[PDB]
């Protein structure tokens, strides 16, 4: 399971997960209007489109989003791209809402704190590389901290709604660099958004994901 | 020459072209705030980033943006991607500003109108296929009406800031589907932007481009 730590993202039918907190709970980084649009409009659309594609292939409604993305070649040609894009959008955003919190921010704790220190040198260096990868992702995409197939932490960015699980990597945490995630408040200033995002990061949840990976 | 009909896009240095009209002139489709950000911030950035990359290889300052994008293999590897993205961004937006007008809109007129009817059947059908292609372009990109190598009109979409001249096609006209082009006024409603955009299309300029094509 990738979306949730305890269960896989179902497709019979695919469901839009409600926000665990209020729309205005992340104001020190993200405006309430964007939270509403991003969740109620963007995330909802990915779920709806995925369900529409699955209707024409009921034999696939038994499998989870994870299973479909892990083996896109087995998905029928007529809906493969639709499943890739919308399935990815569903999974990516489902992870996104969970790794942020009203009482987020601060420096990491526990397991991931020491793992980050060993791999990247320090939390501040990790932060710099993460933001750098974020800024370098030209066009639409995401920046992730993953546990690669070899079991090592690695910063990687992906295009559009592609997810690292397609390569066998476990996405521990990630930030959305599609313009819709920051344009209302930041406009063209992506680096400012990337900087402020750290103030709402939910380290408790990120630690649970690190253990599961 | 692709950016302008009578001249190539220079790189000694690259220059941000002035807007042919006022910032609030296209208000029946695009808000003034977006015209400012899009032209003054986004397009300006592609120009600046391009200039920075070319300073590292002064030789390239003797050629044009079109010449560079037509043969990326000859562009030194250390700045190839940078030139592709920013050179493309500069070329694409330069064309964009010119094909819109305060006095635009209406159905196609003249040569282009005849060729559209002959190729697509009617303007209504062309418009549907154009908007469709624009909606189908997942992530960031552009929708184009090009004259392909065989000399025929064709609707194609490209990712990010890629330009059709990279594939031997002449970009007659095109619409920007990056979210920054419509988020402030339409938010997630991309198809609404695609539909209203037709009210500001400069058919006169498009005819000159079809002819040069
Ligand atoms: Mn998003
Ligand atoms: Mn643009």
The per-residue DSSP string of B49-110 comes to HHHHHHHT-GGGGGS-HHHHHHTGGGS-TTTHHHHHHHHHHHHHHHHHHHTB-TT--SS--H
Resolution to 1 decimal, in Å?
A: 2.0
Residue A154: phi, psi to the nearest 5? -155, 140
Cβ contact B92:B46 at 8 Å: no
Give the CA angle between residues A118, A123, A126 to the nearest 5°: 80
Q: What Rg do the C-alpha atoms of chain A give, in angstroms?
A: 17
CA nearest to A180 within chain B: B179
Task: Please give the residue of chain A at the shortest CA–CA distance from B39.
Answer: A188
CA atoms within 13 A on the CB side of A184: 17
B90, B72, B102, B93: which is closest to B11 by C-alpha?
A: B90
Q: Solved by what technique?
A: X-ray
The minimum CA-CA distance between A21 and chain B, rounded to whole Å, is 22
| Structure-block tokens of residue A58 | 């009921």
User: Which residues, 6 or more positions from B8, have their beta carbon under 8 angstroms from its beta carbon?
Assistant: B1, B2, B64, B65, B66, B67
Q: So where are chain B's domains?
A: 1-213
Contact A179/B184, CB-based, under 8 Å?
no
Longest dimension (CA), chain B: 49
B115-149: burial string, b at 16+ Cβ within 10 Å, e else = bbeeebeebeebbeebbebbeebbbbbbbbbbbee
Q: How far is the CA of A39 from the centre of ligand 1 (A)?
A: 8
What is d(CA A94, CA A39) in angstroms, rounded to the nearest whole number? 9
Give whole-number Cα distances, B80 to A127, B54, B62, B68, in Å: 27, 10, 17, 9
Largest CA distance in chain A: 50
| Six-digit token string for A177 | 């660099």
Q: Indicate yes or no: CB of A188 within 8 angstroms of CB of B140.
A: no
Tokens of A34: 């964007």
Within 8 A by CB and 6+ apart from B192, the residues are: B186
The alpha carbon dihedral of A59, A60, A61, A67 has a sign of positive
């Amino acid at each position: 399971s990738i979306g949730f730590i305890d269960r896989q993202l179902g497709t019979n039918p695919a469901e839009l997960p409600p926000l665990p907190y209020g729309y205005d709970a992340l104001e020190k980084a993200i405006d309430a209007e964007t939270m509403k649009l991003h969740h109620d409009k963007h995330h909802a659309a990915y779920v709806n489109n995925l369900n529409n594609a699955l209707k024409k292939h009921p034999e696939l409604q038994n499998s989870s989003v994870e299973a479909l993305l892990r083996d896109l070649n087995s998905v029928p040609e007529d809906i493969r791209t639709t499943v890739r894009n919308n399935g990815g959008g569903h999974l990516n955003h489902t992870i996104f809402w969970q790794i942020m919190s009203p009482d987020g921010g601060g420096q990491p704790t526990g397991d991931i704190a020491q793992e980050i220190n060993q791999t990247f040198g320090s939390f501040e260096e990790f932060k710099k590389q993460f933001n750098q990868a974020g800024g370098d992702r030209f066009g639409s995409g995401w920046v992730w901290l993953v546990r690669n197939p070899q079991g090592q932490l690695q910063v990687v960015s992906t295009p559009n709604q592609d997810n690292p699980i397609m390569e066998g990597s476990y996405p521990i945490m990630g930030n959305d660099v599609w313009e819709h995630a920051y344009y209302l408040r930041y406009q063209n200033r992506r680096p400012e958004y990337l900087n402020n995002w750290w103030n709402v990061v939910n380290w408790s949840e990120i630690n649970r994901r690190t253990q599961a990976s």
